[PDB]
Every structure is written in structure tokens, then in C-alpha cells.
Curated annotation (Swiss-Prot), chain A:
The gene is BAIAP2. Phosphorylated on tyrosine residues by INSR in response to insulin treatment. It comes from the Eukaryota. Isoform 1 and isoform 4 are expressed almost exclusively in brain. Isoform 4 is barely detectable in placenta, prostate and testis. A short isoform is ubiquitous, with the highest expression in liver, prostate, testis and placenta. Adapter protein that links membrane-bound small G-proteins to cytoplasmic effector proteins. Necessary for CDC42-mediated reorganization of the actin cytoskeleton and for RAC1-mediated membrane ruffling. Involved in the regulation of the actin cytoskeleton by WASF family members and the Arp2/3 complex. Plays a role in neurite growth. Acts syngeristically with ENAH to promote filipodia formation. Plays a role in the reorganization of the actin cytoskeleton in response to bacterial infection. Participates in actin bundling when associated with EPS8, promoting filopodial protrusions. This is BAR/IMD domain-containing adapter protein 2. It is found in: Cytoplasm; Membrane; Cell projection, Filopodium; Cell projection, Ruffle. The chain holds residues 2 to 228 of 552 of the full protein. The IMD domain forms a coiled coil. The isolated domain can induce actin bundling and filopodia formation. In the absence of G-proteins intramolecular interaction between the IMD and the SH3 domain gives rise to an auto-inhibited state of the protein. Interaction of the IMD with RAC1 or CDC42 leads to activation. The SH3 domain interacts with ATN1, ADGRB1, WASF1, WASF2, SHANK1, DIAPH1 and ENAH. Residues 131-148 form a coiled coil. Residues 1-218 form the IMD domain. Homodimer. Interacts with CDC42 and RAC1 that have been activated by GTP binding. Interacts with ATN1, ADGRB1, EPS8, SHANK1, SHANK2, SHANK3, WASF1 and WASF2. Interacts with ENAH after recruitment of CDC42. Interacts with TIAM1 and DIAPH1. Interacts (via SH3 domain) with E.coli effector protein EspF(U) (via PXXP motifs). Interacts with E.coli intimin receptor Tir.
Length: 222, 231
């Protein structure tokens, strides 16, 4: 390591600062934004029922009519398809709250605070092994300049501190990057987890309509 | 129990009555729930945007990361799939509005008033033919009791045959008039339930296109995103 092992230290620092300065505040925004989105979804849930019952009611009247009885069956079936799709939506929504939103809230609420302490702790021991090396060198200097094997004790003590430091930094940086990568990953995963539940929503709708649509269409063209 | 003409006449009156007293009111309630449902979805549309921006921003922060840049793309793709799907919703929405709701709205608005005039016109006309028949048949009975068999003058017998002729004609016109009203009644009734189903179909057709566009975008990318997670 040259005088560039300074960069590695400085980098560990920025990684921690950036998670606090940008990552968490933006994630919070993401959460709030997601919640707003969640709230609108729940809205569709309540309104869906009013519509459902109105379909059924048209269905009943048709089933009670003088000569449009067969159409009552079409209406009921349409209401039925709506009920099932509406249920797959609620499944997705529940998965939106329980696996993405609630999770992220919990993992972000105190995260900056701990990263702060984690960073401070890192710098502290980093500053410690540095001050210990300097003072150790400020001695190998007081000796070499005074001698104008006690020297062998330092040159070999310096190199040990130089090693124990170079591998404390490199070590911090590794952890740091894990810290950064892990937070994005977690986000992506849960997103996938809900996107997967989303798929089961569209697939059921596509499926359900595929079966019934041609029949409803024929009942009309009848 | 006044023949098939009286029974059919009654069904005509009940058919118009059911369209005005139940079909139309329940249809207005249907439109009303349709609109509440429409607003709800519209609500989703707006929130969708903010969510979109958020995703993109996390994507940008990831592309500027040191060792998470890869994930930046997975987020951007998710943002994309979401934006597209969101547009497909806007569409189902537009058809839900332009083909069903607005359509049922003007159809229903002044309907019972026209159905009401239609009913009255039918009732009035079928009552004239009915009264005309009864009077006619009444003057006949009145004429017969003046009969003196073998001695009835030609003036007499000719008049009787004139009435028999007229009764036969009025009698038949009335029957068809009622018989014709009934067919039209069933058509008025039939047509509305049918129009509802049609529009419901059009919206369903739109709904399939949205749901299907969703399954392709996700079934296509999900497995790949599933990999980026695997790291």
C-alpha cells in the first residue's frame, strides 16, 4: 500500500456517509410514496364491492325478467369474474404492505443512527492505530538521531503496526460495500416478492377472462 | 282471464312498468357505483406516479453506487414494467368511461319519460279499439232483439251482416294491436339488458388486454430480476 491506502479509508467513510445522506432519506421517500400508492389501492377495494352488487342486481332483474333470463347468467358470471380478480388484487396489496412497505419501514427507521455509530467506531480505531504508529515512528526517529539492537525493535514494530493498519482499512471497506450492497438487494428482493404476487394477479385475470369472454360475446351476438 | 288478448295486454303493461320501476332505477345505481369505482381507479393512477419517481430515484442512487450498479438496472426495469402496466390501466379506465358509464348515462337519463309516453300511447289506442269493439258488439245485440225471424226486412238482415263484418274486423285488429305491443314490449325490455352486457363485454375485452400485457412484462423480466437478487 502506497499513500493511496488513504483513498481506501476515505472511501469507507463516503460509503457510510452516502447511505445516510442519500440512501435512507430517499428510501423514506420511496416508503411514503409506496404508502400513498397502497392507500389508493385499498380505495379500489371498497369501491369494487359497490360495483359488484350493482352487477348482481342487474343480474337478478334479468333472471326475473319476462324474456331476458339467459342474460342474468352472463351478468352473474361477469360479477363472479370481478369478485375473483378483486380477490387476487387484495392478495397482491396485502403482499405490498406486509413484504415491502412494513419491512422497509422497520429496516430504515433507526438505520442512519446505527450506521453513524458504526462509522464513528471505525474511524476511532482507525485514528487509534494511526496515532500508535506515528508515536512509534516519532521514536525510531528520536533514537536514530541520538545514536549519532534497540533500533531493530522499532523498525520491526513499525512494520507490524503498518500491517495491522493496512488490513484494518481494507477490512472496513469490505464491510462498507457489503453494507451498501445489502440495502439495495433487500429492496430489490421484496420488490420481486411483490412483483411475483402481481403476476399471479394478472395471470388469473387473463385466465378468467379468456374462458368467459368468448361465451359472453356469443350470448350477445346471439 | 279475458282470452289470450287480455293476458298479453297485461304483460305489456307490466313490462314497461318493470323497466321504469326497477331496471332503470337499479341501472342508475349501477352507474353510480360505476363512477365511484372509476374515481377509485383514477386515484390509483395518480399515486402510481409518485411511486414511479421513487423507484427511478433508487435506481439512480444504485447506478452511482460503488458495487451495486447492477441493481440500478433491475430497479429501472421494474419502474418500466410499472409505467407500462400503469398505461394499460389508464386504457381499461378510458373504455370503462367511454363505452360503459357515459353510454349508460345518456341512454338512461330521459328513458323512463319516453317509455312512459310509449306506454300511455299504447294504453290509449288499445282502449279505443276495445271500446269501439264493445260498442259495436252492443249495437248488434240491440239490433238482434228487434228481430222478427222470417219477417225481417232486407234493411234489417243487411245491417246485421254489416255488424258481423265490422265486429270481425275490429276484433282482429285489436288482437294484433295487443299482440304487436307485447312483441315490442319484450324488445324494449330485451334490448336494454342486452346493451348492458355488450358494454360490459367491451370493458372486459379491454380488461383482458391489460391483464395480459401485465403477465408478459412480468413473466419476461421477473426471472431475470430474480437472478440479480441471487447476486
Amino acid at each position: 500500500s502506497l499513500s493511496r491506502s488513504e483513498e481506501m479509508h476515505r472511501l469507507t467513510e463516503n460509503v457510510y456517509k452516502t447511505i445516510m445522506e442519500q440512501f435512507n432519506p430517499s428510501l423514506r421517500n420511496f416508503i411514503a410514496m409506496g404508502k400513498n400508492y397502497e392507500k389508493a389501492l385499498a380505495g379500489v377495494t371498497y369501491a369494487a364491492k359497490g360495483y359488484f352488487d350493482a352487477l348482481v342486481k342487474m343480474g337478478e332483474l334479468a333472471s326475473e325478467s319476462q324474456g331476458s333470463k339467459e342474460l342474468g347468467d352472463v351478468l352473474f358470471q361477469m360479477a363472479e369474474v370481478h369478485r375473483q380478480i378483486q380477490n387476487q388484487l387484495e392478495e397482491m396489496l396485502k403482499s405490498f404492505h406486509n413484504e415491502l412497505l412494513t419491512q422497509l419501514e422497520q429496516k430504515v427507521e433507526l438505520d442512519s443512527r446505527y450506521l453513524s455509530a458504526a462509522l464513528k467506531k471505525y474511524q476511532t480505531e482507525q485514528r487509534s492505530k494511526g496515532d500508535a504508529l506515528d508515536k512509534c515512528q516519532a521514536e525510531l526517529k528520536k533514537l536514530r538521531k541520538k545514536s549519532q539492537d534497540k533500533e531493530l525493535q522499532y523498525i520491526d514494530a513499525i512494520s507490524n503496526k503498518q500491517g495491522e493498519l493496512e488490513n484494518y482499512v481494507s477490512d472496513g471497506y469490505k464491510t462498507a460495500l457489503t453494507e451498501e450492497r445489502r440495502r439495495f438487494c433487500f429492496l430489490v428482493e421484496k420488490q420481486c416478492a411483490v412483483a411475483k404476487n402481481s403476476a399471479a394477479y394478472h395471470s388469473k385475470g387473463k385466465e378468467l377472462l379468456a374462458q368467459k369472454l368468448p361465451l359472453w360475446q356469443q350470448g350477445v351476438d346471439s
